[PDB]
């Protein structure tokens, strides 16, 4: 038989919509008193049971990201708090499936930001696939003690506390087959310095293209395409959205967005099913 | 024999500060309804008289940018209006100095947006220097009747209504001497698709580096550098600001920003005198 896709509900973040869809609200002399609004956006990860491997795409937040002794800086916690339930953390979502981190053959990190690489430290054996430039950038923020970005220096510290099976994607690598029907795509520079996507072909359905922050929501996707806020490389980002569209459409893959509330409702969480 | 630089006051625009310094205001859980604020930013152009040249850098807004049959689309008029006084237009500022458009040898367009290339149609003889990619972009918006950007379709129509002496800077061209002590710099892709700067050496002080929207304000310039909103190419933008800093500091030139209210107020205007 073929590939199984489990959707891991790793909670929510509460954030200004302007970060997610740039300039969705702004003041004007005509309408000078308007304010932007907070939205709650889903944090997720995807466990793929392949033929000959188990592959995890993304890892959510660190279970202890929030609080006075939390992983996230105090100001980060004020600005855009993780809001998820006690259950909504990757180690629990794995134990709920009968899995330890060690049972995962490879974990594909879309990139090394806060609510994507938060559980990297739980993986002492699994192959950790991340873009080489994403690795270089994360470790630089850590080495300089710079808390000003979505890279979490305290999380990075834990990643580096013990040797791990890092496998860094070269910036000129285009794609890698991870297993039959499972292709790792190197989106490269855009939202962050090195974005990775995962194409997963299924049996009852053609399958899914996992894109993470290469496209936050269906409203970013369009058409017309609409930029997120806080993009590292806007040109790379725009090019990557067009590539995502062409790749998925030519293959009838449904694109699964990084943080789309209404798509994430509608899915089917790992505690009560999987895709086949 | 010495170069003379005139500062031309071409009025002001009212606009949400979040466009000028990105994410200067955003909502959070504890401050869920704060509004951004409107700021008034100066629009300017620079006239350089040299022994064997008269060079203009930028051109302001079209004098008839606002109104029911104004050049600007209603959305722009409503959202970020021009609010300059009646005399604050390029033809008048030249008239005040006893000059006509045909007295200008060369007009250097920093780029081809609304409040920079608004008076290009007045120049039927002068050499019009613009980056080739910036020209290509502007025409594309006009050709598709696309009003959605800072490119003004109705101004571009007027530019194209008669042949003009366009001299387009190649993508790979680094710098051009326009006259002794006046050097055209090709900043390339960043704020828009092709940005041009102008280094102007004087006799009684080192001089000035005119950078237009490659750096809107001293706040963008820093340190620490802070990105503007609505940037075409954030990476090229970042590199351009670093290049501006290195170029100017190494030569002790004063960087004149695209829309810095405090800086502009400090400058001697063309109606009061000029720099030598
Ligand atoms: Zn991210
Ligand atoms: Zn994300
Ligand atoms: Zn501009
Ligand atoms: Zn401007």
From Swiss-Prot, chains A, B:
Q: How is the cofactor bound?
A: Binds 2 Zn(2+) ions per subunit.
Q: Which reactions fall under this protein's catalytic activity?
A: an N-acyl-L-homoserine lactone + H2O = an N-acyl-L-homoserine + H(+)
Family, according to the entry, reads as follows: Belongs to the metallo-beta-lactamase superfamily.
Molecular function per GO: acyl-L-homoserine-lactone lactonohydrolase activity; metal ion binding
Q: Which residues bind Zn(2+) 1?
A: 111, 113, 191, 213
Looking up CDD domains in the UniProt record yields: AHL_lactonase_MBL-fold
Cofactors (names): Zn(2+)
Q: Report the protein name in the record.
A: N-acyl homoserine lactonase AiiB
Which EC class, in a word? hydrolase
- What phylogenetic lineage does the species belong to? Bacteria, Pseudomonadati, Pseudomonadota, Alphaproteobacteria, Hyphomicrobiales
Q: List each coiled-coil range.
A: none
The gene coding this protein: aiiB
Q: Which UniProt keywords apply?
A: Hydrolase, Metal-binding, Plasmid, Zinc
SUPFAM superfamilies assigned to the protein according to its UniProt record, in alphabetical order: Metallo-hydrolase/oxidoreductase
Q: Which domain of life is it from?
A: Bacteria
Q: Where does Zn(2+) 2 bind?
A: 116, 213, 259
**E.C. number:** 3.1.1.81
